[PDB]
Amino acid sequence: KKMSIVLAPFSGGQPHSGVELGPDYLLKQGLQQDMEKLGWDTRLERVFDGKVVEARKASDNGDRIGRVKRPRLTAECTEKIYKCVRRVAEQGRFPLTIGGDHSIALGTVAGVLSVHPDAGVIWVDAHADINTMSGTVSGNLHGCPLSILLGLDRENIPECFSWVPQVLKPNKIAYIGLRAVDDEEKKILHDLNIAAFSMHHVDRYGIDKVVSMAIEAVSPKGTEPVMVSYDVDTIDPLYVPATGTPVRGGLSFREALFLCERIAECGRLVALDVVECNPLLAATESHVNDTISVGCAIARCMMGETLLYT
Amino acid sequence: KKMSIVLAPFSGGQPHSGVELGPDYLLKQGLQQDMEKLGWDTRLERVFDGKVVEARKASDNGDRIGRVKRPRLTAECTEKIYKCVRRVAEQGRFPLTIGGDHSIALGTVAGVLSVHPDAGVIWVDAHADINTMSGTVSGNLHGCPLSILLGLDRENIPECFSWVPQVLKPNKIAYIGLRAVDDEEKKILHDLNIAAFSMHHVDRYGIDKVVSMAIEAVSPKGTEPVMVSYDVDTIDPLYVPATGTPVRGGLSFREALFLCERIAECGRLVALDVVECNPLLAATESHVNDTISVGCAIARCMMGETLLYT
Amino acid sequence: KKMSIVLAPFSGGQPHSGVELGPDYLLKQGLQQDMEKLGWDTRLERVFDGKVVEARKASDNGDRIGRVKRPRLTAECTEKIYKCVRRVAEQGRFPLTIGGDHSIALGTVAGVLSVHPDAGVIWVDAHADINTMSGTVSGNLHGCPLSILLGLDRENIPECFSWVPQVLKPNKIAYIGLRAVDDEEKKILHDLNIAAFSMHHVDRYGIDKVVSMAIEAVSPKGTEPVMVSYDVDTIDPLYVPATGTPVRGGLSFREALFLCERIAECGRLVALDVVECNPLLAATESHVNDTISVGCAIARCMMGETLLYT
Numbered sequence: 059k060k061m062s063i064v065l066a067p068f069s070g071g072q073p074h075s076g077v078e079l080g081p082d083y084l085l086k087q088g089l090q091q092d093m094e095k096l097g098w099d100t101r102l103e104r105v106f107d108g109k110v111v112e113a114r115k116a117s118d119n120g121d122r123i124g125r126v127k128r129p130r131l132t133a134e135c136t137e138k139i140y141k142c143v144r145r146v147a148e149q150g151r152f153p154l155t156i157g158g159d160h161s162i163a164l165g166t167v168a169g170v171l172s173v174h175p176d177a178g179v180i181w182v183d184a185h186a187d188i189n190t191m192s193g194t195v196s197g198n199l200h201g202c203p204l205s206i207l208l209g210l211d212r213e214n215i216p217e218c219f220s221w222v223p224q225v226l227k228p229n230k231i232a233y234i235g236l237r238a239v240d241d242e243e244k245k246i247l248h249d250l251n252i253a254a255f256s257m258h259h260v261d262r263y264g265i266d267k268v269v270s271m272a273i274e275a276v277s278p279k280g281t282e283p284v285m286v287s288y289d290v291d292t293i294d295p296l297y298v299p300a301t302g303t304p305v306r307g308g309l310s311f312r313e314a315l316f317l318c319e320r321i322a323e324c325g326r327l328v329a330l331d332v333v334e335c336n337p338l339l340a341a342t343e344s345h346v347n348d349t350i351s352v353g354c355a356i357a358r359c360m361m362g363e364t365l366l367y368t
Numbered sequence: 369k370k371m372s373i374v375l376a377p378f379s380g381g382q383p384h385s386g387v388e389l390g391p392d393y394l395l396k397q398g399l400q401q402d403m404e405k406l407g408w409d410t411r412l413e414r415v416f417d418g419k420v421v422e423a424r425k426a427s428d429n430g431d432r433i434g435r436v437k438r439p440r441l442t443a444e445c446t447e448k449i450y451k452c453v454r455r456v457a458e459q460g461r462f463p464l465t466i467g468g469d470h471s472i473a474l475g476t477v478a479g480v481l482s483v484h485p486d487a488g489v490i491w492v493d494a495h496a497d498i499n500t501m502s503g504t505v506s507g508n509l510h511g512c513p514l515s516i517l518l519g520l521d522r523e524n525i526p527e528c529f530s531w532v533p534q535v536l537k538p539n540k541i542a543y544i545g546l547r548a549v550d551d552e553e554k555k556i557l558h559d560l561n562i563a564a565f566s567m568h569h570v571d572r573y574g575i576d577k578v579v580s581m582a583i584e585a586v587s588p589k590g591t592e593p594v595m596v597s598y599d600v601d602t603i604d605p606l607y608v609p610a611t612g613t614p615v616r617g618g619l620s621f622r623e624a625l626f627l628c629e630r631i632a633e634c635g636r637l638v639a640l641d642v643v644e645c646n647p648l649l650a651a652t653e654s655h656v657n658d659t660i661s662v663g664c665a666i667a668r669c670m671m672g673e674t675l676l677y678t
Numbered sequence: 679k680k681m682s683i684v685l686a687p688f689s690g691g692q693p694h695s696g697v698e699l700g701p702d703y704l705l706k707q708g709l710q711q712d713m714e715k716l717g718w719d720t721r722l723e724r725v726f727d728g729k730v731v732e733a734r735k736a737s738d739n740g741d742r743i744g745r746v747k748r749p750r751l752t753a754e755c756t757e758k759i760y761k762c763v764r765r766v767a768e769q770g771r772f773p774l775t776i777g778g779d780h781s782i783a784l785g786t787v788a789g790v791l792s793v794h795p796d797a798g799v800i801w802v803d804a805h806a807d808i809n810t811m812s813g814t815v816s817g818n819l820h821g822c823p824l825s826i827l828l829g830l831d832r833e834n835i836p837e838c839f840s841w842v843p844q845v846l847k848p849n850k851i852a853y854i855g856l857r858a859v860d861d862e863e864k865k866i867l868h869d870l871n872i873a874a875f876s877m878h879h880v881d882r883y884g885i886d887k888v889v890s891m892a893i894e895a896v897s898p899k900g901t902e903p904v905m906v907s908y909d910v911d912t913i914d915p916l917y918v919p920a921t922g923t924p925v926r927g928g929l930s931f932r933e934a935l936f937l938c939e940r941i942a943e944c945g946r947l948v949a950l951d952v953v954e955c956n957p958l959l960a961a962t963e964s965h966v967n968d969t970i971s972v973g974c975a976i977a978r979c980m981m982g983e984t985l986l987y988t
């Protein structure tokens with residue numbers, strides 16, 4: 059029962075700067091003490107200095123490729139997270155990565171699937187994050203990780219991303235909480251028949267059935283390892299206000315945590331990302347604490363914490 | 369795929385004046401662009417000038433019949449909406465009427481059922497709006513449309529309402545979201561065995577089962593056209609604050625829209641009313657935008673918009 | 679159909695003083711008029727003066743036994759509530775007790791089970807309130823009533839509590855809404871196999887199934903009388919803000935009341951406690967009204983009020 063909290067304070071996948079402060083805020087809330095309190099032998103893994111990275115991030119506007127912003131910086135930092143996560147998993151430890159915007163999942167998923175090729179991926183997000191290099195309108199890379207991981211539109215992916223191992227297939231990723239999918243992304247999920255459970259399915263079937271369907275969708279043999287990449291904006295902005303891309307009509311605080319308890323319950327969780335916490339994008343300090351405490355709650359519930367005896 | 373957005377800026381069915389500004393606010397939010405964006409060939413239909421109507425509304429206190437307020441003005445304006453909606457439906461276009469208080473449904477339902485006599489009616493509301501002429505305590509006509517449409521207490525309905533065609537029967541109307549029913553109304557729904565699904569049923573069975581039961585209740589042959597008259601106060605005041613009669617414990621933003629997606633999904637929706645938006649009864653501007661954006665969201669979801677590919 | 683509203687303005691079971699004002703606030707909201715309006719012949723029963731009790735409560739810090747605070751005062755006042763409630767039930771009236779912190783349930787449950795030994799108990803709370811005398815960390819007695827009622831850790835219960843009749847067994851108590859259970863309490867519910875339905879079960883099965891399971895858990899013959907001890911902090915703080923121990927992720931306003939309607943619906947409710955309303959712990963006056971109105975709503979729904987005809 060060993061764990062490595064991989065710190066990935068990266069904001070190059072999007073415009074707003076506060077998101078790279080996420081790792082520190084979670085740790086200040088006592089994230090590591092909570093994990094140890096849950097019986098986990100933990101250790102921190104700093105992939106790179108967030109200030110040094112943000113210094114180059116906010117200054118280097120020339121880092122572009124058409125509409126795509128900061129492909130170079132993102133490719134570099136993401137490769138490092140990949141190496142770190144890959145290493146943590148090979149050492150037999152559970153990698154719990156804290157972001158940072160969702161572009162870091164390019165390295166986390168790559169790292170985990172490199173050690174666990176049969177691992178399924180449950181993407182908890184209000185967004186599909188699967189825009190292609192030539193299809194993204196905003197050019198914000200935190201909304202394109204899955205396209206790169208799946209090797210879509212390879213005829214347009216930069217050479218600086220050639221390091222990304224092609225280990226994630228479309229039948230091994232399932233979404234939960236979708237409600238702000240771009241038309242290009244819609245076509246993509248449809249053409250590739252990717253298991254996507256929107257807020258419609260949650261409202262229609264209830265969170266429990268959706269989580270079960272999501273686990274089943276990526277676990278054919280019913281024995282595969284499972285990884286969860288958790289974007290906090292999946293949770294309704296009234297619970298998680300401090301985030302870059304909030305979308306109305308998300309999961310309630312209860313569903314957000316119940317989902318974690320159901321996953322932890324299956325016992326095959328092998329990795330977890332908690333991304334998009336941005337303390338700066340908070341109206342009041344109650345917005346900060348409410349968002350950061352949610353990040354730690356997700357971790358605790360994912361990692362074993364229950365309401366009753368266990 | 370032709371549509372006519374019938375503008376019905378009427379507030380004579382209740383005390384507060386801002387409700388007649390609803391049509392303009394929705395259109396300012398881009399309601400028509402959204403409908404066209406959904407592939408609808410749309411056109412606007414102005415039934416009457418809202419300012420001219422409100423001028424007479426706020427001044428003519430003498431327009432009364434006992435407890436009943438503004439029966440004359442309501443009868444006149446409502447007959448016009450009836451003629452307009454009837455015309456739009458005969459022209460083969462989908463009439464999407466924006467209010468305005470709910471007294472406008474006297475003309476919308478009358479107009480639609482006059483062209484589609486087998487059409488079922490789903491009344492989404494926190495209230496039953498079925499008080500009789502001699503039974504209403506407030507005298508606000510927006511809470512009596514269904515009594516007049518059903519021909520209840522005819523022995524007390526004014527001659528100025530004699531224009532209302534008797535085309536709606538009790539087994540063709542189903543409620544969703546009820547939670548503020550007057551005792552007289554309770555007796556009525558019971559005696560007439562009207563399909564009424566309260567917040568109790570939503571809490572008990574879930575929104576999906578309730579919508580299904582509501583569609584089935586008014587669609588015996590399973591092929592009848594369906595009309596939805598949507599009062600925004602059905603949605604909990606914390607999502608739709610700018611409204612005249614808010615009632616605690618309503619539908620969540622998600623259920624409010626999921627209901628629309630389920631209806632649009634059956635493919636037999638033939639008309640839609642979106643009523644009771646009152647921008648003036650908003651604490652802040654965030655209350656206005658939150659309420660008006662909800663009105664447009666209902667329209668989009670009712671008219672075909674989905675979270676995933678379709 | 680006779681009822682006695684037992685007033686129990688006690689705050690000695692916890693630190694904050696405003697909770698003893700609950701009874702008065704509910705009554706000011708028209709609690710008694712509501713009950714009579716529901717056809718109940720009601721009468722008030724004042725067990726003791728709240729000011730006199732609070733005067734001694736806030737001054738006598740010496741009233742302690744280790745970590746346990748105010749065991750003497752709590753034992754005395756609680757015995758009185760026991761005598762009063764026992765009397766009301768013997769007179770054939772329904773005892774609706776208003777608190778006051780939850781330590782008053784030591785007298786209410788004792789009083790009711792003394793007349794109805796087969797009565798089941800449904801404890802609606804975010805907390806288990808079953809800490810033992812020697813196991814409580816805070817020493818606040820409102821979090822220990824069930825341990826004393828069940829006769830747990832009797833080897834450590836003070837003589838001033840020897841008056842408590844041992845009439846409640848572990849298979850006759852079922853919880854609903856748990857989400858802040860102490861580790862010692864967890865072990866206890868597990869070892870005694872007490873039916874405990876946490877927010878997990880509500881999120882997993884829905885409120886309706888949970889209420890049904892709770893009623894079944896304490897009603898083996900399916901004919902036993904049922905008593906509900908309702909702690910308002912079970913409801914999410916965003917609906918019930920004015921309370922001493924709010925916990926995030928509670929029941930929605932709708933579930934909180936639906937639960938009441940389902941219970942009232944079985945027809946075997948024999949007693950009800952509505953505890954922990956503290957008007958002083960309110961940010962604004964809207965926090966007060968929102969909390970107090972909830973208390974009265976619980977009463978109305980428990981006592982027969984429905985959304986439709988009945």
Ligand SMILES: N[C@@H](CSCC[B-](O)(O)O)C(=O)O
Nearest residue numbers: 160185189196200201240303
């Ligand atoms: N469709 C948008 C969404 S980006 C969402 C990023 B994330 O899911 O990590 O908040 C885009 O491509 O900019």
Ligand SMILES: N[C@@H](CSCC[B-](O)(O)O)C(=O)O
Nearest residue numbers: 470495499506510511550613
């Ligand atoms: N029972 C009330 C309710 S009026 C409700 C109007 B509407 O449902 O359109 O907000 C009355 O008769 O005044």
Ligand SMILES: N[C@@H](CSCC[B-](O)(O)O)C(=O)O
Nearest residue numbers: 780805809816820821860923
């Ligand atoms: N575990 C805490 C909880 S006390 C809860 C009291 B009440 O459920 O009535 O709000 C303790 O022993 O102080």
Ligand SMILES: [Mn+2]
Nearest residue numbers: 160183187289
């Ligand atoms: Mn994301």
Ligand SMILES: [Mn+2]
Nearest residue numbers: 184185289291
């Ligand atoms: Mn997102």
Ligand SMILES: [Mn+2]
Nearest residue numbers: 470493497599
């Ligand atoms: Mn209405």
Ligand SMILES: [Mn+2]
Nearest residue numbers: 494495599601
């Ligand atoms: Mn209404």
Ligand SMILES: [Mn+2]
Nearest residue numbers: 780803807909
């Ligand atoms: Mn309690």
Ligand SMILES: [Mn+2]
Nearest residue numbers: 804805909911
């Ligand atoms: Mn409690």
